[PDB]
Amino acid sequence: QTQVLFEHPLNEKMRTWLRIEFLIQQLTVNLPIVDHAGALHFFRNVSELLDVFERGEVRTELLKELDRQQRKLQTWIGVPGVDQSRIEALIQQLKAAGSVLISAPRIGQFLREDRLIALVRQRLSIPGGCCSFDLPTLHIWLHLPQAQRDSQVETWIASLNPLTQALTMVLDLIRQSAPFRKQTSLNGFYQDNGGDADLLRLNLSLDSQLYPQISGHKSRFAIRFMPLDSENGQVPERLDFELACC
């Protein structure tokens, strides 16, 4: 209510996850697709996902984590106070998402094969290249009955469910595995060890208008708090916040 949430990947792996998570969230944000603006927002995000998918196989590494989490969960059975009824549920959801992720076809393949999305991607690299005279097919597509568009869009988004499921569950688990430890950075500088951490979470004061500019280093790091307004904003000597290495 009065704190801002900042996250930072401590490794290239978590970096690809946070990105793929964001791009997928965007797809369903401005729905339904009614105007040209909305369409661009959609295909653009879809295109970004297809760009990161080419680089490497996100499937394997995401399965690896689903199992890693299954093991983290089972180490909590027996511990007095643990709601083991909730644990067995998660462990099954992980396995469910595991099979679903395996049985499904190559990630984003259905989107790559789509004729429409293919044409739109070509003109995203061009500043003003996604106009009507550049994308006639898209212009017609935006005049068809609203039901038809919702139909195709739903399908496009559905094809990522296997990825969306495993992804949202991995990150959700990691985010809650570690609590927020209160810290105090003086002079706008912080230095600590991350350890076996994949993610950093920071809750800064809404009124400080400051943001963490974290730098990496092996397993440790370095946070440099800077003001949104570099022309008018200040950085005090005392900065009490909340950190959490996940």
Binding site: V79, P80, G81, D83
Partner: peptide, 12 residues
């Protein structure tokens, strides 16, 4: 020992 357990794994 009991607070060392993640809040989402912590209930009855």
């Amino acid at each position: 020992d009991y607070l060392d357990i993640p809040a989402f794994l912590r209930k009855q």
